[PDB]
Amino acid sequence: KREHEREVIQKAIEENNNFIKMAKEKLAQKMESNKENREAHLAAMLERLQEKDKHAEEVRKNKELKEEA
Amino acid sequence: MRECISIHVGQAGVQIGNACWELYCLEHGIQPDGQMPSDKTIGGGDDSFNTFFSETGAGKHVPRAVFVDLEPTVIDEVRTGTYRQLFHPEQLITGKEDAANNYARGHYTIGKEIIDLVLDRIRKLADQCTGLQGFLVFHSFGGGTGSGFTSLLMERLSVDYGKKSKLEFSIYPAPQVSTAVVEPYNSILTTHTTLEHSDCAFMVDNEAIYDICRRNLDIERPTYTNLNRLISQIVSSITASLRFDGALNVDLTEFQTNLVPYPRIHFPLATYAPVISAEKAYHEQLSVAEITNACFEPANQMVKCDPRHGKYMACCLLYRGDVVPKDVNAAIATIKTKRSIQFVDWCPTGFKVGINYQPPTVVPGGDLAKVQRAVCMLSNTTAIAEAWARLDHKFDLMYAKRAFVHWYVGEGMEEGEFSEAREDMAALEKDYEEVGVDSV
Amino acid sequence: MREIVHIQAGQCGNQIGAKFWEVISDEHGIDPTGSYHGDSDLQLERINVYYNEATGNKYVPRAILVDLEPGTMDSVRSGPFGQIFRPDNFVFGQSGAGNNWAKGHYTEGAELVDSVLDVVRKESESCDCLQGFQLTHSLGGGTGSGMGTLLISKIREEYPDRIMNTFSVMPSPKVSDTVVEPYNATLSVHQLVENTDETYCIDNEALYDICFRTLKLTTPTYGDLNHLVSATMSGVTTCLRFPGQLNADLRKLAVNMVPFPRLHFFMPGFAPLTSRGSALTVPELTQQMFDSKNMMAACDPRHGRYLTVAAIFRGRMSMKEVDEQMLNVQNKNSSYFVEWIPNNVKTAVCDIPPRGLKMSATFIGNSTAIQELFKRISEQFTAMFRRKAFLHWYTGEGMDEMEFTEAESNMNDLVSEYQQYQDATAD
Ligand SMILES: Nc1nc2c(ncn2[C@@H]2O[C@H](COP(=O)(O)OP(=O)(O)OP(=O)(O)O)[C@@H](O)[C@H]2O)c(=O)[nH]1
Ligand SMILES: Nc1nc2c(ncn2[C@@H]2O[C@H](COP(=O)(O)OP(=O)(O)O)[C@@H](O)[C@H]2O)c(=O)[nH]1
Ligand SMILES: COc1cc(S(=O)(=O)Oc2ccc3[nH]c(C)cc3c2)cc(OC)c1OC
Ligand SMILES: [Ca+2]
Ligand SMILES: [Mg+2]
Ligand SMILES: [Mg+2]
């Protein structure tokens, strides 16, 4: 009976510690996944905008080509 | 001992916190400067009201509360309001930019910049407690902060405080006094995220409170102040057992044992009576039987649903004022034979009764009449799933077209979280159906 | 607080922008020298949204004036409120745009865009919490349409997490006879779809029709049209400038009004629209702001469905009446509101009415009927593009037929997207 009493209080501690561990890992995963996703969206937006600057630096390149002809 | 720390998140949580703490001071005789002449022990004490108020050496009674909002405007009113001296400045935490009604900004983008600071302040309050019992979290479902930051805070509190009790006072969105069109999204996301981290959640449907103020107080266009003063009465009844003490007083956790048969079934339905104006309460003394009977009228419930169409799993009656058990038993006997009270076959049908002798208090100049006695009923009924169904249906209409989802994905969330949250809500609705089915 | 940076580009943008600053300064009690001679403290609670606090209680508009020729620039400085603007915020070129989109976007505006961004950087760095940017411009000229969209992309590059708002003026044959205006608008629309969070469609055809039909003006001038624009801009910014339970900002408007990022083109509406030489009630005011004749875009809302609607009532009036009337119009016209967006109509009441009015109402709607405005521009575009008329203006600046075709197809895709959600149902 004393052995069972130890096992019950040890099981209660294990399940409370596991609950704290599961929450800490779940939150760490979500915050890391969110940071990667949001950065990837901002990087994609800047990629399109920086590509537009490449197209702008190229349109001006065509006019300088034809004005000297 | 058994201190309770209140956390008020977002505009709805903060403003309800203003009404609740103002009502607490009136009930306990605390002046706006924090002084309580009736308290003869200076700098501390083990009185019942010390579960909600800490005492300084100067005799100031300081609420065990933290007010959090991602924008300063609502909390700045606390900082300059009538009860400004009641709160230490560290208890009032603000950012510079709110969540823009976006759960993702409340939970991830804006919230993560202040979440550590909030936890440090909560830790400061917790270290002042000899016997910290749990937390009361006040927030709205529909706000970006009230949904996003609350769920982040709830997850962090589970890590920092384990399975220590966390009770919710949640504002259920209503179109009459709504704020955003994406509130069904925020409500489902926060309910899914908080579900395993909350032990008990008292939902308040803004439409139900709006209807009660219009009907029972003859207010054509009720304000947030009107709703909050009524909400604070329900909150005061629930917390009265912790803040007061008596022979017939029954602790809230003892009610919580009856209210939660399964971990996910922890959304009690609250009903309050009497809600009456001073003009109608004049020369009208409402008896124990009359207010008890009003608890089973659906028009007095905090969440619009029909308990007659569902099954009861618990029924608790929290009386305050001039009430004796003899009247309560007679009142309950009449109701049992005249009302549609069907219990599930796996729980006893008895009613659990608590009585606080401290009479209800009203805010001077308010629209609620001061009555000799009042009662709040906390029932666990399957009918509250109707609130989830209506909310989940509004979610389905928008998510079928993926409308407004890009505002959430742009902040780092994924479509998988939406469907995962909605499926969790579908599981909750199925769980409420299952508990109501009779045994084989 | 929440600060907004204002940018006016081109002749049209600088003209309507100046009138905007004149009206709101009077609403906030600001004289042309920048001092506060107002009567109510409600005019200064949210004053720093558009103004800066200088030395000696001088409120300076947080505005930047841009043009490729100093013509419109010098007339604004010599106007009534020309001395309130910060002198260093006047950024004007010399070569001019000549109503050429390629000049403003690629050739001439690019030579000046870097100097404009420097003034933007100074103003944005001085903000405690920058909301975003509002741009007043036209889609028919060269500087407003070409350099205006180039500024948007450049600002979006350094401030990708800030809201981009535009007051875009649509070209109309009834107002300007410039033939290359359908080209300038389509190229600009191809830019506004990709790089703006919210755009107010100020249609000159609708403005001309309001003046000609309702105002009974035989010969409407630009001042007559701008009187409609100034009232519209005063309204749609009232919740930004005045306090209330709303705590309105640019992002909250975008989140609740824009169900899909590309469909961010709003149809403004104003009421009452009375003429000089003619007591309005709330039911008459609500029904008037939902009327097709009161729309600042030449679109019939009965020809489409409302995705989202935001309404503002200015003046001392019964709030209970406004709630009933706004509910009344939704019930009687439930077919014209999408069923898959619950509670898609928002209402606010402001106690401060505009100058010279007791009550008013300004309408912001995201209606699928806005495709009527885009169809007209597309029809005028493809009529010339099929003949390849006046293409030497743009090809000589470095462009080719690909950019025109991409602009045409993208705007054609925009209309079909507005049609997709008009035909969408709940079941
Ligand atoms: N009962 C009650 N409800 C409120 C009150 N204030 C706001 N609400 C409700 O809260 C919902 C909107 O959430 P808010 O609390 O205002 O938003 P928030 O928590 O500040 O988060 P943000 O989006 O960042 O502003 C609406 O459905 C309102 O009905 C209040 O004082 N009393
Ligand atoms: N409503 C209104 N429209 C204008 C005004 N000025 C120009 N426009 C419109 O803008 C178009 C020409 O754009 P413009 O002002 O020349 O742009 P810019 O080349 O950048 O200066 C025409 O189709 C006009 O209808 C104005 O003051 N009010
Ligand atoms: C200055 O512009 C405004 C800003 C705002 S907001 O910041 O409160 O955003 C919201 C909040 C709830 C919403 N529900 C819907 C359908 C749209 C919407 C927008 C509201 C407005 O209308 C009253 C505005 O126009 C005057
Ligand atoms: Ca004491
Ligand atoms: Mg807020
Ligand atoms: Mg011109």
Residue ranges of domains in chain C? 2-259, 260-369, 370-427
Residue B47 to residues B36, B41, B51, B64, C39, Cα–Cα distance (Å): 13, 9, 8, 14, 52
3-state secondary structure (DSSP) of residue C253: helix
- Distance, in Å, from the CA atom of C180 to the CA atom of C171, rounded to the nearest integer, reads 10
Kind plus residue range of the DSSP H or E element containing B376? strand B373-381
Give CA B90 to chain center in angstroms.
Answer: 24
Return the number of other C-beta atoms located less than 10 Å from residue B142's C-beta: 28
- Distance, in Å, from the CA atom of B117 to the CA atom of B318, rounded to the nearest integer, reads 37
Type of residue found at C50: Y
Type of residue found at C190: H
SS3 content of chain C, % helix, strand, coil (to 5): 50, 20, 35
Contact state of C260 with B97 under an 8 Å Cβ cutoff: no
CA within 13 Å, CB half, C411: 30
> Is C363 exposed, middle or buried, given 0-12, 13-18 or 19+ CB atoms closer than 10 A?
buried
Q: Is the dihedral angle over the CA atoms B273, B278, B280, B281 positive or is it negative?
A: positive
Contact state of C129 with B97 under an 8 Å Cβ cutoff: yes
Burial C206-230 (b: 16+ CB within 10 A, else e): bbbbbbeeebebeebebebbbbbbb
Q: Which residues contact B189 (CB under 8 A, 6 or more apart)?
A: B103, B107, B147, B148, B151, B417, B418, B421
- Distance, in Å, from the CA atom of A29 to the CA atom of A23, rounded to the nearest integer, reads 10
- Distance, in Å, from the CA atom of B169 to the CA atom of C56, rounded to the nearest integer, reads 48
Residue B85 to residues B31, B79, B243, B306, Cα–Cα distance (Å): 10, 8, 21, 44
Ligand 3 centre distance from Cα of residue C248 (Å): 6
- Distance, in Å, from the CA atom of C265 to the CA atom of C295, rounded to the nearest integer, reads 13
| Interface residue A9 vs chain C (CB under 8 A) | no
SS3 content of chain B, % helix, strand, coil (to 5): 50, 15, 35
Sheet arrangement for strand B4-9: B92-94, B65-69, B4-9, B134-140, B165-172, B200-205
- The reply to whether ligand 2 has any atom less than 6 angstroms from the CB of C229 is yes
DSSP-assigned letter for residue B138: E
Residues within 6 Å of ligand 3 by CB: B 180-181; C 236-240, 246, 248-249, 252-253, 256-257, 308, 310, 312, 344-346, 348, 364
Q: Is B254 a catalytic residue?
A: yes
CB-proximal residues (5 Å) to ion ligand 4? B 39, 41, 45
Identify whether the C-beta of residue C252 lies closer than 8 Å to the C-beta of residue B100: yes
Residues B364 and B418 in one domain: no
Phi, psi of C138 (to 5 degrees): -120, 160
- First-last CA distance in chain A: 102
- First-last CA distance in chain C: 44
Residues B310 and B374 in one domain: yes
Q: Which residues contact C196 (CB under 8 A, 6 or more apart)?
A: C152, C164, C165, C166, C264
Residues B236 and B289 in one domain: no
Q: Is the dihedral angle over the CA atoms C112, C115, C117, C119 positive or is it negative?
A: negative
Ligand nearest to the backbone CA of B105: 1
- Per the structure, the count of domains in chain B is 3
DSSP-assigned letter for residue C127: -
- Selected residue of C392, C397, C404 to mutate for chain A interface (largest A Cβ count, 10 A): C397
Phi, psi of B439 (to 5 degrees): -80, 160
Picking from B214, B237, B268, the residue at the C-terminal end of a domain is B268
Residues B213 and B320 in one domain: no
- Distance, in Å, from the CA atom of C192 to the CA atom of C185, rounded to the nearest integer, reads 10
Burial B368-390 (b: 16+ CB within 10 A, else e): bbebebbbbbbbbbbbbbbbbeb
Q: Which residues contact B115 (CB under 8 A, 6 or more apart)?
A: B149, B152, B153, B156
Find the domain containing B417 and state its range: 384-440
Kind plus residue range of the DSSP H or E element containing B224? helix B224-243
Closest residue by CA, ligand 3 atom 14: C346
Type of residue found at C239: C
Tokens matching residue C32: 């042309």
Residues B164 and B309 in one domain: no
Give CA C356 to chain center in angstroms.
Answer: 22
3-state secondary structure (DSSP) of residue C363: strand
Beta strands in C129-193 (DSSP E): 130-138, 163-170
Q: At what angle do helices B224-243 and B10-28 cross, to 10 degrees?
A: 50
Residue B94 to residues B107, B363, C3, Cα–Cα distance (Å): 15, 27, 18
Closest chain B residue by Cα to residue A22: B159
- DSSP lists the bridge partners of residue C98 as none
Contact state of B413 with A35 under an 8 Å Cβ cutoff: no
Phi, psi of B314 (to 5 degrees): -170, 150
Nearest atom (ligand 3) to Cα of C308:
16
Put residue B81 in one of left, alpha, beta given phi > 0 → left and psi -120 to 50 → alpha: beta
Residues B249 and B279 in one domain: no
Contact state of A20 with B158 under an 8 Å Cβ cutoff: yes
A vs B, Cβ pairs < 8 A, gives 42
3-state secondary structure (DSSP) of residue C169: strand
> Is residue C142 part of an annotated ligand binding site?
yes
- Distance, in Å, from the CA atom of C58 to the CA atom of C51, rounded to the nearest integer, reads 9
Contact state of A42 with C106 under an 8 Å Cβ cutoff: no
DSSP-assigned letter for residue C94: S
Type of residue found at A17: N
Identify whether the C-beta of residue C200 lies closer than 8 Å to the C-beta of residue C230: no
Ligand 1 mutation pick, B68, B70, B109, B179, max ligand atoms within 8 A of CB:
B179
Q: Characterize the bridge pairing of strands C3-9 and B200-205.
A: unpaired
Type of residue found at C107: T
Shortest CA gap B180–chain C (Å):
6
Closest chain B residue by Cα to residue A40: B412
- The reply to whether ligand 2 has any atom less than 6 angstroms from the CB of C65 is no
Residues B285 and B228 in one domain: no
Residues B278 and B196 in one domain: no
3-state secondary structure (DSSP) of residue B219: coil
- Distance, in Å, from the CA atom of B67 to the CA atom of B92, rounded to the nearest integer, reads 5
Burial C326-350 (b: 16+ CB within 10 A, else e): beebbeeeeebbbebbbbbbbbbbb
Nearest atom (ligand 1) to Cα of B106:
24
Tokens matching residue B197: 């981290």
Tokens matching residue C371: 């495709």
Report the candidate in C253, C250, C264 with the shortest Cα–Cα distance to residue C3. C250
Shortest CA gap C129–chain B (Å):
7
Q: What are chain C's partners, defined as 3 or more CB pairs within 8 angstroms?
A: A, B
Query: Helix and strand tally (H, E) in chain C?
Result: 15, 12
In sequence order, which ranges of C352-400 are alpha helices (DSSP H)?
371-387, 392-395
CA within 13 Å, CB half, C421: 31
Ligand 6 centre distance from Cα of residue C312 (Å): 33
Ligand nearest to the backbone CA of C171: 2
Residue C388 to residues B382, C376, C383, C397, C405, Cα–Cα distance (Å): 70, 18, 9, 16, 11
CA within 13 Å, CB half, B333: 6
Report the candidate in B5, B50, B302 with the shortest Cα–Cα distance to residue B164. B5
> Is A8 exposed, middle or buried, given 0-12, 13-18 or 19+ CB atoms closer than 10 A?
exposed
DSSP-assigned letter for residue C323: H
Identify whether the C-beta of residue C62 lies closer than 8 Å to the C-beta of residue C7: no
Closest residue by CA, ligand 3 atom 25: C236
- Distance, in Å, from the CA atom of A40 to the CA atom of A46, rounded to the nearest integer, reads 10
Identify whether the C-beta of residue C301 lies closer than 8 Å to the C-beta of residue C338: no
CATH of domain C370-427: 1.10.287.600
- Asked if the C2-259 domain carries CATH number 3.40.50.1440, the reply is yes
Q: Is the peptide bond before B274 cis (omega within 30 degrees of 0)?
A: yes
In sequence order, which ranges of C212-281 are alpha helices (DSSP H)?
222-236, 238-241, 250-257
Residue B254 to residues B49, B167, C272, Cα–Cα distance (Å): 19, 14, 62
Identify whether the C-beta of residue C172 lies closer than 8 Å to the C-beta of residue C204: yes
Residues followed by a break in chain C (C to N exceeding 2.5 Å) are 278
Q: What are chain A's partners, defined as 3 or more CB pairs within 8 angstroms?
A: B, C
Residues B335 and B202 in one domain: no
- Distance, in Å, from the CA atom of C112 to the CA atom of B116, rounded to the nearest integer, reads 45
Kind plus residue range of the DSSP H or E element containing B8? strand B4-9
Ligand 1 mutation pick, B108, B177, B189, B226, max ligand atoms within 8 A of CB:
B177
Report the candidate in B185, B275, B179, B186 with the shortest Cα–Cα distance to residue B227. B275
CATH of C260-369, one of 3.30.1330.20, 3.30.1490.20, 3.40.50.300, 3.40.366.10: 3.30.1330.20
Q: How was this structure determined?
A: X-ray
Residue C357 to residues C17, C44, C271, C291, Cα–Cα distance (Å): 21, 21, 11, 20
- Give the CA-trace dihedral at C366, C369, C372, C377, to 10 degrees: 20
Report the candidate in C219, C230, C207, C202 with the shortest Cα–Cα distance to residue C80. C230
Q: Characterize the bridge pairing of strands B53-55 and B61-63.
A: antiparallel
- The reply to whether ligand 2 has any atom less than 6 angstroms from the CB of C204 is yes
Picking from B268, B284, B300, the residue at the C-terminal end of a domain is B268
Picking from B216, B247, B268, the residue at the C-terminal end of a domain is B268
Tokens matching residue C341: 């967006």
Report the candidate in B439, B436, B347 with the shortest Cα–Cα distance to residue B383. B436
Q: Characterize the bridge pairing of strands B373-381 and B269-273.
A: antiparallel
Return the number of other C-beta atoms located less than 10 Å from residue B18's C-beta: 23
Residues B100 and B222 in one domain: yes
Residues B77 and B94 in one domain: yes
**Catalytic site residue from B97, B196, B254, B434:** B254
- Distance, in Å, from the CA atom of B252 to the CA atom of B259, rounded to the nearest integer, reads 10
Residues B307 and B407 in one domain: no
